[PDB]
Amino acid sequence: RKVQSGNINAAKTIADIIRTCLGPKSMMKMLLDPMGGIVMTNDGNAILREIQVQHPAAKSMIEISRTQDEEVGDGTTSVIILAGEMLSVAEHFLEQQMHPTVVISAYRKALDDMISTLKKISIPVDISDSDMMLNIINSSITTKAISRWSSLACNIALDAVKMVQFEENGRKEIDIKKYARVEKIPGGIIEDSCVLRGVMINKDVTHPRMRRYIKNPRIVLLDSSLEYKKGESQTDIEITREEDFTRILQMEEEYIQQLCEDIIQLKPDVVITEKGISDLAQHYLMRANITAIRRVRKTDNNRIARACGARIVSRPEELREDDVGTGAGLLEIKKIGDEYFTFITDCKDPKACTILLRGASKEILSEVERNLQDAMQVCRNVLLDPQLVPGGGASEMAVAHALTEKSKAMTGVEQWPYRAVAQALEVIPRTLIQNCGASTIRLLTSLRAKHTQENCETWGVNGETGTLVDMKELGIWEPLAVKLQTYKTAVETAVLLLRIDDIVSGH
Amino acid sequence: TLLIKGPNKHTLTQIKDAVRDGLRAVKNAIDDGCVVPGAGAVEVAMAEALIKHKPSVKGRAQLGVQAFADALLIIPKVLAQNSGFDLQETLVKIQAEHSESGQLVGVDLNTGEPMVAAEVGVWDNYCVKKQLLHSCTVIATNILLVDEIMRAGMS
Amino acid sequence: TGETIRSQNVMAAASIANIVKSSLGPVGLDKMLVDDIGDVTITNDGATILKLLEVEHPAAKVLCELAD
Amino acid sequence: EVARAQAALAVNISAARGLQDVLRTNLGPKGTMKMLVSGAGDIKLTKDGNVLLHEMQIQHPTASLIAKVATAQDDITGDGTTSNVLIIGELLKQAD
Amino acid sequence: KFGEVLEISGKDYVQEVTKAGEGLWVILHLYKQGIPLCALINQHLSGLARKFPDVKFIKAISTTCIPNYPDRNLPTIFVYLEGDIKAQFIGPLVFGGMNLTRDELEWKLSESGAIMTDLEENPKKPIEDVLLSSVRRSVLMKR
Amino acid sequence: MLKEGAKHFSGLEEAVYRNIQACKELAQTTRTAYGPNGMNKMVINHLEKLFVTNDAATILRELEVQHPAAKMIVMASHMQEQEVGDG
Numbered sequence A: 001r002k003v004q005s006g007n008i009n010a011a012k013t014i015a016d017i018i019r020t021c022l023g024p025k026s027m028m029k030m031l032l033d034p035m036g037g038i039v040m041t042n043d044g045n046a047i048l049r050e051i052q053v054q055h056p057a058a059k060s061m062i063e064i065s066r067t068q069d070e071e072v073g074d075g076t077t078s079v080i081i082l083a084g085e086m087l088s089v090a091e092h093f094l095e096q097q098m099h100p101t102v103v104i105s106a107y108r109k110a111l112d113d114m115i116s117t118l119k120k121i122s123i124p125v126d127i128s129d130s131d132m133m134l135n136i137i138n139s140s141i142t143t144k145a146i147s148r149w150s151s152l153a154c155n156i157a158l159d160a161v162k163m164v165q166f167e168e169n170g171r172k173e174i175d176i177k178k179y180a181r182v183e184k185i186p187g188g189i190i191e192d193s194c195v196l197r198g199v200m201i202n203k204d205v206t207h208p209r210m211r212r213y214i215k216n217p218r219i220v221l222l223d224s225s226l227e228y229k230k231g232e233s234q235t236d237i238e239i240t241r242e243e244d245f246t247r248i249l250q251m252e253e254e255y256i257q258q259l260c261e262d263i264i265q266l267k268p269d270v271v272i273t274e275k276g277i278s279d280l281a282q283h284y285l286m287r288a289n290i291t292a293i294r295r296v297r298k299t300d301n302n303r304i305a306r307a308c309g310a311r312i313v314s315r316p317e318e319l320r321e322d323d324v325g326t327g328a329g330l331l332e333i334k335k336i337g338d339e340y341f342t343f344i345t346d347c348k349d350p351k352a353c354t355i356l357l358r359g360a361s362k363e364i365l366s367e368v369e370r371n372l373q374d375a376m377q378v379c380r381n382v383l384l385d386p387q388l389v390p391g392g393g394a395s396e397m398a399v400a401h402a403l404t405e406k407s408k409a410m411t412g413v414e415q416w417p418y419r420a421v422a423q424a425l426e427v428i429p430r431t432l433i434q435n436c437g438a439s440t441i442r443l444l445t446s447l448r449a450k451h452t453q454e455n456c457e458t459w460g461v462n463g464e465t466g467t468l469v470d471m472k473e474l475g476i477w478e479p480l481a482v483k484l485q486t487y488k489t490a491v492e493t494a495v496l497l498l499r500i501d502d503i504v505s506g507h
Numbered sequence B: 001t002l003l004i005k006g007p008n009k010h011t012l013t014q015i016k017d018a019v020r021d022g023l024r025a026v027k028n029a030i031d032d033g034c035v036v037p038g039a040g041a042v043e044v045a046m047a048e049a050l051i052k053h054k055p056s057v058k059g060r061a062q063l064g065v066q067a068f069a070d071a072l073l074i075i076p077k078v079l080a081q082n083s084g085f086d087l088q089e090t091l092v093k094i095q096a097e098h099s100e101s102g103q104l105v106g107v108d109l110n111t112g113e114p115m116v117a118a119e120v121g122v123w124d125n126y127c128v129k130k131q132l133l134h135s136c137t138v139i140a141t142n143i144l145l146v147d148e149i150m151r152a153g154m155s
Numbered sequence C: 001t002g003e004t005i006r007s008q009n010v011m012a013a014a015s016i017a018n019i020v021k022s023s024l025g026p027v028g029l030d031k032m033l034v035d036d037i038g039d040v041t042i043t044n045d046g047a048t049i050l051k052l053l054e055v056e057h058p059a060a061k062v063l064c065e066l067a068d
Numbered sequence D: 001e002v003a004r005a006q007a008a009l010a011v012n013i014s015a016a017r018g019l020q021d022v023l024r025t026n027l028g029p030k031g032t033m034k035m036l037v038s039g040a041g042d043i044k045l046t047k048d049g050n051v052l053l054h055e056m057q058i059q060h061p062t063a064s065l066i067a068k069v070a071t072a073q074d075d076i077t078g079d080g081t082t083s084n085v086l087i088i089g090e091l092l093k094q095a096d
Numbered sequence E: 001k002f003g004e005v006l007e008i009s010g011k012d013y014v015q016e017v018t019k020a021g022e023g024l025w026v027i028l029h030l031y032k033q034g035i036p037l038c039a040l041i042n043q044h045l046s047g048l049a050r051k052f053p054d055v056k057f058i059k060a061i062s063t064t065c066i067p068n069y070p071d072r073n074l075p076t077i078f079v080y081l082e083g084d085i086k087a088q089f090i091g092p093l094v095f096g097g098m099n100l101t102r103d104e105l106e107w108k109l110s111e112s113g114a115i116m117t118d119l120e121e122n123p124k125k126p127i128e129d130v131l132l133s134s135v136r137r138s139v140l141m142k143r
Numbered sequence F: 001m002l003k004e005g006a007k008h009f010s011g012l013e014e015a016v017y018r019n020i021q022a023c024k025e026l027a028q029t030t031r032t033a034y035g036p037n038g039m040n041k042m043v044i045n046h047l048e049k050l051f052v053t054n055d056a057a058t059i060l061r062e063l064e065v066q067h068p069a070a071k072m073i074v075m076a077s078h079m080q081e082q083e084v085g086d087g
């Protein structure tokens, strides 16, 4: 029994790195470069990403933390600390007789009891009014950021969140990552950011000749199968001589005539094209009562695949009679600013609005981007479950007390690991007290003696002074799903690290 | 055009840098309308106001107030050391002169006697002292919060 | 020679057999395998361990061949 | 890999005291000038604070970072890079 | 004309300066046994050759060029054309350790500049400082 | 230690020592002349002819010094030579 010890040693070594980086009064780490550089930062994720280890358990924990940060976005630091504490309090004390069997059942029972206690303590909330949501967002975002234009940004983010939801059918699916981006354009007053349809068009449309103005037509986008290819599936035609180049014009004319005879009744406009631009064929194409655009990047592809819904397949002609393009859509090339902008309004797949902000340099861009990101993340974490829990260090004490009471009432045989895993939940209050700068023994004793009278479970420790205060007068609340996900991830990591036998090599 | 000549060496660049610093100081002294005296007559009054007339009564705050006030008397000591005199004698002389009179007493670089810098011609700026204090506070703040220094990184 | 290489083969067989010993039955621990690259595979099946394992001994090779 | 002590603050205070003791004899009109020569024997006389801090070979990374931070805040006012490291060093010594 | 990776000895390294035409950007990888970085580089090149068959990739065991070498000849890559050196690389510091996934192709496209497929984006870059960034932000806000 | 790289022996104590000893050693190889006397010195550089001179101008024009205190005087010497005749 030496592999588990070597695994928990590396686990505790990894966990004892970013332990003093929690709370408003956190420390700052510094990393030196081998060439002669030094960078100081207080971000645990940056230190975890810039680290290089060699143990498989450390890499697995890093991957788990990265997955937890990418899936949720809040609560990717205390998981490793809790896992290391549970390991050091369980395996480093209850493995002298070598019995790795009842520990898994004890962990499962403790997880079930913690889930039941956290579910039987939540309070309901209403989502009718908007002032309470804004107040909750402002209270949860007051961490380490500027305070000057946070109200307007949070209001715009809440409006975008309430407007981007449309995929409801019983499962409540919310997607804002690949469904709402950010646009930037300098010039003008900074007090005009709002929401708009948002079309990724800058300098892609090129009209050498002056034609008619676009008012409110019916644009029906097709596919991208008109480049430097050899045809459909045979090599009968190849772009090699000028005769083939001038026959390509007649071929495209015949193709557009076949398309018009097939399924052209709303008169589309521009079409997606990757290759194909000249000074003679483009004139004939424009004269053929059709237009074509080029210069398409990944952003335009994502926009036409999300908002419009354009797919990629080997089928340019003969499509569905009612595929895309259903509704009156205006496309006026406005001259506001200095670049060409399109405002495709009222078309297919609505509720896909983006933001419109006019700042200045790149600092304003970065700050509004991070503000929108954190506000949208907070709104998504809050709207996912209308249940709040008083954080700060009040629910963990009640959970530990309930677990101890259940263990004393059941009077079982495996009560020692249960008590060990129940008493290993007071790490966050101890760390907060240590970061505040006070006694970690007398304060803990007072908090333990206070959480046992009658109806007292909202008394936590202030993160700025170092005294016990009720949560009903401060205003520190956390969502419910985040704590459950954190506990489940910690339990799964402990189970995975506890079920490791021998390690060998292979192919 | 400010045409300058030199004896064909590298001191011409030094003279150009000196005249550029002088022009910058003149431009800084023309944008505002308030000029406070210098010659080490502002740190003494600041320390006397921070030590005596305490804003509040707290030992924890005083433990830092005393350290911040004791670090502002290094400029006159360094000036007296570089001028060629003592360090504590001139200091206590200036202290007694400021406690008996009550005016801005400067430092003399000729005889080491306490004199008034408001009648000779020594002047200074306004925003320069504020910027220096802000920079010193920013530097001294983000230093004591250093926990541990690990050896990692690749880029 | 003679009685030495036989003892060596017996020791090698015992060492290669004392690996899948703690994985018999439905109640067993997991085993991690590395391909000397960076990826790890966690499995508790005896067949998967015997199939994904490096060998260098002739007796062990013929034993793995007979098992397959 | 594993370090849980207070040697970082100690070496920081040591580097700050060294940087304060290195540059401290260039205050007042009665100071001493300095010379710099290394590239093809180019004699360059200087006495300023930013000009010296911008053209030096410091072997300590913390002192180099402190000098860079001090020089980055010199484009605000006229000349304020001098008479700054002494007060910072005194405050750091008092804090230590 | 080339899309596979083969093992050469010493004759190909000399005949490549005469067999190449129209400026063939050949690449040679010094493979070392017992290092996973070489295996990762080979696995990446196995896909990079199929992604762009307009160039040539070859691998050679670090034992031909200067056989009397200690442990300083670190495994790297060498890009050649007709007999000119275009800033060769050495050491794993330029790659980024064992955390390389999509930076080698970006560096190759930046060094070549002829088959750029809209890959002019900037890398992630190392972590920034908390003091210099704050100073720059304060300067931008004051002015 | 903090600024230099074990190249020069400069600090807060070499001023009243090396800056004077360098000039003393530079001037000690010059007091042998100055006056109507026969103290010829041979000069061997690149001509490979072995010629003896008496004036200090050709002696200083061939000697290569690697010290700033010794180089601070050759400039004044050249200035005096360009100004008036002797000296």
Ligand SMILES: Nc1ncnc2c1ncn2[C@@H]1O[C@H](COP(=O)(O)OP(=O)(O)O)[C@@H](O)[C@H]1O
Residues within 6 Å of the ligand: A021, A022, A023, A024, A074, A075, A076, A077, A078, A391, A392, A393, A460, A461, A462, A463, A464, A476
């Ligand atoms: N005003 C406050 N009063 C009490 N506790 C606070 C206060 N502000 C922050 N905290 C506590 O500090 C902790 C900060 O955690 P955080 O570092 O954000 O976790 P993560 O790094 O996983 O996002 C929170 O758990 C919260 O309970």
Ligand SMILES: Nc1ncnc2c1ncn2[C@@H]1O[C@H](COP(=O)(O)OP(=O)(O)O)[C@@H](O)[C@H]1O
Residues within 6 Å of the ligand: B038, B039, B040, B075, B107, B109, B122, D026, D027, D028, D029, D079, D082, D083
């Ligand atoms: N005429 C003067 N008489 C006495 N002290 C002076 C005089 N001019 C400047 N000082 C002193 O020099 C110090 C600043 O000198 P220095 O660091 O060289 O910056 P600056 O060149 O801007 O004066 C001030 O603290 C001031 O007390």
